[PDB]
Amino acid sequence: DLPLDPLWEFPRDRLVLGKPLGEGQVVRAEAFGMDPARPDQASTVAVKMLKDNASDKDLADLVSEMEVMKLIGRHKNIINLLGVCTQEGPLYVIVECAAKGNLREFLRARRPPGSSEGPLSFPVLVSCAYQVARGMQYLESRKCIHRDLAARNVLVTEDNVMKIADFGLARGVHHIDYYKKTSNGRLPVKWMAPEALFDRVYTHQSDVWSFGILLWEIFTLGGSPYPGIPVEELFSLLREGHRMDRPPHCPPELYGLMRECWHAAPSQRPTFKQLVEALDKVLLAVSH
Numbered sequence: 001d002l003p004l005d006p007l008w009e010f011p012r013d014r015l016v017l018g019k020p021l022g023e024g025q026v027v028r029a030e031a032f033g034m035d036p037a038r039p040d041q042a043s044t045v046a047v048k049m050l051k052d053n054a055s056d057k058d059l060a061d062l063v064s065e066m067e068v069m070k071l072i073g074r075h076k077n078i079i080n081l082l083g084v085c086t087q088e089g090p091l092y093v094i095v096e097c098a099a100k101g102n103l104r105e106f107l108r109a110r111r112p113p114g115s116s117e118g119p120l121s122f123p124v125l126v127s128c129a130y131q132v133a134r135g136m137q138y139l140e141s142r143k144c145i146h147r148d149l150a151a152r153n154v155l156v157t158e159d160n161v162m163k164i165a166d167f168g169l170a171r172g173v174h175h176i177d178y179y180k181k182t183s184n185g186r187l188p189v190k191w192m193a194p195e196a197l198f199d200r201v202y203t204h205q206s207d208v209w210s211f212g213i214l215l216w217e218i219f220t221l222g223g224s225p226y227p228g229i230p231v232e233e234l235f236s237l238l239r240e241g242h243r244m245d246r247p248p249h250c251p252p253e254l255y256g257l258m259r260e261c262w263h264a265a266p267s268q269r270p271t272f273k274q275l276v277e278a279l280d281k282v283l284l285a286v287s288h
């Protein structure tokens, strides 16, 4: 069973399914008449569906993610829900499709060779960071705690709009496995805050810690956090107050905000609202 939510319901026959994107499995599609102002117009979207092997639990995960997306609402800096297909077939959840892929691969693809300068100068990297903070400010105001904020979960559109992905999984029924390898072989637990790692508690300020790590990923052009360090010793270092060094090409304002994001005590970290305003002021400092 699945109830008709008429206003989110999109007829599945107006989708032309295309290339698999990844893995719950995801396909690119063309959708006709997403915006009812031009009802025959094609747009490109991403469609999520269950795999053949799926259990009750997998269905509940996809459904719960869809329902949290409905509740959270739309914002320019997040992957927005566009539609769902729940009648007369398998469940499809339809979302915005970001043509340049994830921010980690985007950054890594644009690292310059040797000392030669690259396209992604300080103001560009700061603007990126600002966009991510605006998305997170939005999520924060909607009482959403991400639990896996990282460059791999930020997608880049054709117009270089940064969009937060996978923000429905925590309030959803899905259990995040922080020891499940990224496509890169890295471990998500390297973005988790010490209160979650040691005290087993998550707060709104836990995502701020993760944002600090994401800042570091940005200014290293898609580098691996705590490079060289196996998680076991990483965790003992984090006991003694170890923090990542300022990366080689980074404005001091941004390292300053990283250090603030990485206060041991969650209650001492800034909010995304404060972070948005701070990055707005850095951009102006730097670009004028």
Ligand SMILES: *CCC(=O)Nc1cccc(C)c1Nc1ncc2cc(-c3c(Cl)c(OC)cc(OC)c3Cl)ccc2n1
Pocket (backbone or CB within 6 Å): 021, 026, 028, 044, 045, 046, 047, 048, 065, 066, 079, 093, 095, 096, 097, 098, 099, 100, 101, 102, 155, 164, 165, 166, 167, 168
């Ligand atoms: C848009 C055309 C394209 O080829 N895009 C593409 C190629 C290679 C890698 C990536 C990451 C993409 N873009 C892309 N854009 C948006 C995506 C959105 C999701 C997604 C889904 Cl399907 C759901 O389903 C409920 C929920 C999400 O988070 C709230 C997200 Cl982020 C998956 C993959 C996407 N890929």
